[PDB]
Amino acid sequence: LLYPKLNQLSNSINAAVAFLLEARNLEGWWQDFNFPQAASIGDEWVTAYVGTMLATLPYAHVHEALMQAWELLKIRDHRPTGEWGYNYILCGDADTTGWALQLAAAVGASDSERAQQARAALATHLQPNGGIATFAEESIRAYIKVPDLANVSFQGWCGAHTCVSAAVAALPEFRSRLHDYLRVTQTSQGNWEGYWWSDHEYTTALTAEALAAGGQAADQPSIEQAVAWGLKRLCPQGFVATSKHPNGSTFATAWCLRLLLLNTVDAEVKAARAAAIGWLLEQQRPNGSWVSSAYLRIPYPFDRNPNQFPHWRYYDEIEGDKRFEGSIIFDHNSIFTTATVVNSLVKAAPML
Numbered sequence: 131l132l133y134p135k136l137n138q139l140s141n142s143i144n145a146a147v148a149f150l151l152e153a154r155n156l157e158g159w160w161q162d163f164n165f166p167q168a169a170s171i172g173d174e175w176v177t178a179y180v181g182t183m184l185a186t187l188p189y190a191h192v193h194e195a196l197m198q199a200w201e202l203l204k205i206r207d208h209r210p211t212g213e214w215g216y217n218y219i220l221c222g223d224a225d226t227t228g229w230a231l232q233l234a235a236a237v238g239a240s241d242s243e244r245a246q247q248a249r250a251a252l253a254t255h256l257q258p259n260g261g262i263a264t265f266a267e268e269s270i271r272a273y274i275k276v277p278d279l280a281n282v283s284f285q286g287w288c289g290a291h292t293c294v295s296a297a298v299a300a301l302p303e304f305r306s307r308l309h310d311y312l313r314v315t316q317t318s319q320g321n322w323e324g325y326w327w328s329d330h331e332y333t334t335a336l337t338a339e340a341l342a343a344g345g346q347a348a349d350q351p352s353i354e355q356a357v358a359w360g361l362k363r364l365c366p367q368g369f370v371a372t373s374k375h376p377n378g379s380t381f382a383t384a385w386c387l388r389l390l391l392l393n394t395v396d397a398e399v400k401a402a403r404a405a406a407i408g409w410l411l412e413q414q415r416p417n418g419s420w421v422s423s424a425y426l427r428i429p430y431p432f433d434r435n436p437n438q439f440p441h442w443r444y445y446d447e448i449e450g451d452k453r454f455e456g457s458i459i460f461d462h463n464s465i466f467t468t469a470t471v472v473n474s475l476v477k478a479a480p481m482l
């Protein structure tokens with residue numbers, strides 16, 4: 131054990147926590163992502179996710195920040211369903227609501243009236259195939275005011291999503307109901323593929339974690355195949371290479387590192403985690419952030435199969451007329467990515 135590397139993990143985590151606490155807005159929200167001149171900037175979703183990521187820290191001042199985040203989420207009580215959404219002006223969605231319920235658990239509020247109401251609302255998003263859909267059709271059509279989408283199918287946006295199903299399965303009340311859907315959606319290579327995310331490491335880590343938390347021996351082969359996939363994804367240099375980041379995605383690497391925590395016996399897995407930690411420590415910026423790489427994609431509303439859509443472009447790189455559909459946006463504040471990385475390092479440190 132190299133005590134310098136453990137001490138650098140302390141210093142790295144601390145610098146990231148400082149960045150994240152200072153990055154909150156006037157009311158105290160974490161904000162990230164932007165749909166310019168339209169849905170604008172995420173707050174409820176980003177705050178629920180960042181708060182959940184930070185729940186792994188033992189620090190009293192971090193717990194205080196999470197208690198404040200929950201108070202802010204409870205003030206967002208304007209939707210008749212009790213759900214949360216991307217930000218104030220969006221309708222409710224199952225993904226935001228699921229992350230908000232994970233944050234509620236971290237602050238002892240799983241049994242609160244609001245949490246009970248929001249969990250009940252999640253049940254409306256369950257699909258006949260046993261997964262969770264992000265949106266109710268009536269709610270998201272009401273929000274969207276784009277003429278050429280008026281009479282189009284929303285069955286893509288309102289279908290079962292593996293990414294959101296995996297996140298909701300982190301909630302004990304839903305884990306058993308979503309089990310079979312998560313099992314049957316695993317690919318032949320051992321990974322899962324998500325709807326709103328480019329990086330399969332996110333959906334794969336969350337799904338394997340939900341199967342692990344259920345404790346069923348029947349699920350351990352699936353978990354092990356996912357870990358084997360993660361080991362393949364991680365380069366010897368310590369990063370997951372992507373088309374966009376061929377020398378390593380900080381977001382994909384952090385999620386892969388979380389996936390690899392699910393096997394604590396295999397020496398190759400242990401060495402891969404050590405490599406990923408070293409690379410992440412080297413990539414940290416002086417302000418304690420990591421480079422933004424949380425790539426959120428917007429399929430057409432009618433598209434059930436975004437992993438079969440070869441036309442993705444980065445919204446911020448498109449010249450001239452552009453639309454959100456078929457484009458990828460990112461966490462311009464680096465809050466989403468940094469929270470992800472810092473969580474992965476806190477969880478992985480003790481397994482060095």
Ligand SMILES: CC(C)=CCC/C(C)=C/CC/C(C)=C/Cc1cc(C(=O)O)cc(O)c1O
Nearest residue numbers: 168169175216223225226276326428454455
């Ligand atoms: C927490 C979740 C589920 C994140 C996934 C991304 C997501 C769907 C954000 C919600 C905001 C939204 C509808 C962005 C797309 C859009 C907006 C408009 C508009 O605001 O006018 C128009 C579009 O055509 C469009 O695709």
Ligand SMILES: [Cl-]
Nearest residue numbers: 241242243244
């Ligand atoms: Cl209550």
Ligand SMILES: [Cl-]
Nearest residue numbers: 375376377378
């Ligand atoms: Cl790169």
Ligand SMILES: [Cl-]
Nearest residue numbers: 435436437438
């Ligand atoms: Cl797909």
Ligand code: NA
Nearest residue numbers: 242243244245
């Ligand atoms: Na309440």
Ligand code: NA
Nearest residue numbers: 271272274275
């Ligand atoms: Na509409």
